[PDB]
Amino acid sequence: KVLRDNIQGITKPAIRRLARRGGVKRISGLIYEETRGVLKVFLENVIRDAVTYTEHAKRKTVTAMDVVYALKRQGRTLYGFGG
Amino acid sequence: NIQGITKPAIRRLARRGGVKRISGLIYEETRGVLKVFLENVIRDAVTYTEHAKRKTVTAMDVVYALKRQGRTLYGFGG
Amino acid sequence: PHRYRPGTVALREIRRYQKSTELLIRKLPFQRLVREIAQDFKTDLRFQSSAVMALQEASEAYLVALFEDTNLCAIHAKRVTIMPKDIQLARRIRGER
Amino acid sequence: HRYRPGTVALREIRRYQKSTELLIRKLPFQRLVREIAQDFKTDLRFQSSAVMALQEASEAYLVALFEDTNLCAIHAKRVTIMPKDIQLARRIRGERA
Amino acid sequence: TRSSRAGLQFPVGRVHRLLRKGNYAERVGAGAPVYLAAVLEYLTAEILELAGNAARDNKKTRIIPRHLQLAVRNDEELNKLLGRVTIAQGGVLPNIQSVLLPK
Amino acid sequence: KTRKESYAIYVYKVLKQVHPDTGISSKAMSIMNSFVNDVFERIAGEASRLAHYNKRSTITSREIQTAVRLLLPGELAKHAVSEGTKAVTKYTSAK
């Protein structure tokens, strides 16, 4: 079933919570959309790559490993999920 | 030696840098910055020479160093 | 009644979220998002539930790293409030596009 | 007639972005290079291309750096670059801590 | 040759040697030195294209490093690719921030 | 007097293929040669991991291909795969 507008799942209180672990105290209202903007360019990058691995592995299922390899590729190495 | 990196030379680099106006304290700051830079690159470079058992640091040691450091340079035998 | 002054709960919340490690974005929204973006690259993809969880781990880390550097930019500008332009300076400087 | 404060600075930017020649006189640079390396190993020789390589890499880097420095100056409604900018630039680059 | 047999200008032999010797894998397919030599050929064309252009624009018959730099930094897609590469004698693009300009 | 290799002559031939009435300097020639080697490593390298990742011993045109798709920006990748798939098929024509 069709999927639409999901970036707005990234509610404002969460984009808040992250900013707090980030040491930010005062948040301008025009921040919440820019963050979604950024998160999107971010996920579009990791998944373009994750997927390319999945396509190469000739699979219909994207694995924890394809993700981890992608991150490593983008210089955002991640421990905790294999590799 | 370090102070051999002249104020005017540092000014030119900032002009090619797009910078219009320059504080006095910059010039010294630039120097520490440049120093740190060469050190790291030359440390890695020399390590290549030390491992190549050479008296001559080559261009390729430099080039390999810059690669290591993610500051790849073209035009000295890529 | 009673009313904490502006900025008082912010400081509290910072300390809360800096003690813990649990993910900040909700789990389900997050997934829906990732399934979207991925669909729009290739249809008919499935995910190891751990593979979503990886991308999220990687996502939040980034954004928290991001806010960190955003925050510095706010402060650079004799300000205390973060603004899109701040984020924008961090990304130019990080050399993101 | 005299030209105003920053008028010759403006003409100079144009002149240097149009040229590709190196901006530190290669001799004092060269002495700086030998000094720094001596601290890592004694009795050493450099290929003249090895020194040029370093020179290019270093300048290009510093220019890039001023670029990003200059943006921070601007971010702070300023027009003069200051050491506090460089520190922020590098900080966000993740060069400095 | 094989450059011929694939319509390539780029040494399909040279490439097959380099893959085997440069320790990328145990064995090396027949298509890959061809696929790659091609992609190498393709990309060196795009650069030579836009640099040459730039040398015309800058009114010279011979390409110097600058013409490469201009070609590269002005191309949005090439510039990304060489996002971490300093090109010797490249200089910079001319760019002067607004608020720095006179009023 | 050692016989050091490069891509110089082929760079030239391709230069003629695109800008027949244009030339090149040694200084820019080095840059073209550096460019070639760098790109060769990056693609070769990616391909190499690809194989490993997939518990397989061979770097085929396919590995090279997907390597290219990870290494290159949307449009430049697109053409690259073309020229890649083309010269390969054209190669497998002749024998």
PDB file of C-alpha atoms in Angstrom, chain B residues 67 72-78, chain F residues 30-31 34-35 37-38 41-42:
ATOM      1  CA  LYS B  67      46.686  10.394   0.124  1.00  0.00           C
ATOM      2  CA  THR B  72      45.382  13.898  -2.596  1.00  0.00           C
ATOM      3  CA  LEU B  73      47.565  15.843  -5.014  1.00  0.00           C
ATOM      4  CA  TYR B  74      47.864  15.472  -8.791  1.00  0.00           C
ATOM      5  CA  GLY B  75      50.929  16.188 -10.877  1.00  0.00           C
ATOM      6  CA  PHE B  76      53.836  14.454  -9.190  1.00  0.00           C
ATOM      7  CA  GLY B  77      53.303  10.895 -10.369  1.00  0.00           C
ATOM      8  CA  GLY B  78      49.773   9.975  -9.238  1.00  0.00           C
TER       9      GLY B  78
ATOM     10  CA  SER F  30      50.899  14.697 -15.299  1.00  0.00           C
ATOM     11  CA  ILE F  31      47.520  15.754 -13.876  1.00  0.00           C
ATOM     12  CA  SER F  34      47.449  11.193 -11.933  1.00  0.00           C
ATOM     13  CA  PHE F  35      43.724  11.450 -12.530  1.00  0.00           C
ATOM     14  CA  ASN F  37      45.639   6.201 -11.752  1.00  0.00           C
ATOM     15  CA  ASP F  38      43.529   7.641  -8.918  1.00  0.00           C
ATOM     16  CA  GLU F  41      42.524   2.579  -7.849  1.00  0.00           C
ATOM     17  CA  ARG F  42      39.187   3.789  -6.516  1.00  0.00           C
TER      18      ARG F  42
END
